[PDB]
Structures are given as structure tokens and as C-alpha cells.
Design a protein around this ligand. Sequence first.
Ligand code: HEM
Ligand SMILES: Cc1cc(Cl)ccc1O
Length: 137
Amino acid sequence: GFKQDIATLRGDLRTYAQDIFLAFLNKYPDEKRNFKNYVGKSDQELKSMAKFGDHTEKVFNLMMEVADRATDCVPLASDASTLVQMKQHSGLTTGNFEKLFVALVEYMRASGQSFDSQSWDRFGKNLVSALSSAGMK
Ligand code: HEM
Ligand SMILES: Cc1cc(Cl)ccc1O
């Protein structure tokens, strides 16, 4: 289930973090409006860009903590408030999060592994609801 999936992702987190973020950028290329330095790069070129690797790992490190602190895929209100109030998120709306979770779930469904894709779909929807209640547009 969901808690085992957190353990699976954490066991290879740099690889999962990069491949999920690339699945997102490749599914929604207009999302590079928020990542202008990632334009005109293949996946292999992005992986060899220092900030791409370091920011994607730090995003997925925190995402796994938010997932781990969740009850039945419902994140803590404190984690939603933190995500809304981060200066690095000043540009964002809940639709950016929705797209990330649509890409993550499709990535999981395409994997050979027994990921609980329906729990990740719930988690993404519940995080979006929590972000809106914490003040994200
Ligand atoms: C649960 C989901 C997410 C978590 C846990 C999260 C977490 C973080 C963290 C920890 C940072 C600091 C990274 C660093 O400076 O090294 C960060 C920066 C950032 N996050 Fe988020 N994030 C999430 C979703 C998103 C989404 C959906 C977007 C846009 C589609 C986004 C855009 C950014 C941007 C633009 C930065 C600053 C630019 C950059 O670091 O390259 N994040 N995020
Ligand atoms: C800044 C950032 C955002 C997301 Cl959603 C994924 C990876 C990253 O490096």
C-alpha cells in the first residue's frame, strides 16, 4: 500500500525523484514556464544539471515526509501551510500540484511494481484540497 510505496521510493529516491519530475515535465511541457533553465534539454542533460538533481531530491525528500506524516493519504494541515508559505512556491497554484500527481500516478501505473496508484491519486487530490484551505490559489 501507500506506506510501503514510501519505503520503495525512499530506497532509490534520487532515481525515482528524477524520473517522476521528468514524467511531469514531459507530460506538461508548458510547466517549464516555472523552470526556464530546463528548456532545450533532454532528460539525460537535465539529470547532469546540478540544481535539477539537488532541487528534485529535496522536493521528493519533503514529499515522502508529507506522505509519511499523512493519515489515510490525508496530509497534515501544518505540511500544507508550509508548502503554501514557502517563498519558492510564491508563483504556484494548486493546478501545478494536480499535474505533478497526475504524472506520478501514470508513472506508477506504467511501472512493473505493485505501487498502490489509487492511494497516490487520493494523496494528490487531498494535498490539493489542503493547499487550497491553507491559502494557495
Ligand atoms: C508535494 C509536492 C512538493 C514538495 C514537497 C515541494 C518541495 C519543495 C522544496 C523542498 C523546495 C526547495 C528546493 C531547493 O531549493 O533545493 C522547492 C522549491 C521549488 N518548488 Fe516545490 N514542492 C512540491 C511541489 C512543487 C510543484 C508542483 C511545483 C511546480 C510545478 C514546484 C515548484 C518549486 C519551485 C519552482 C521551486 C524553486 C525553483 C527550484 O527549486 O528549481 N514545487 N519545492
Ligand atoms: C523545483 C522542483 C519542483 C518539482 Cl514539482 C519537482 C522537482 C523540482 O526540482
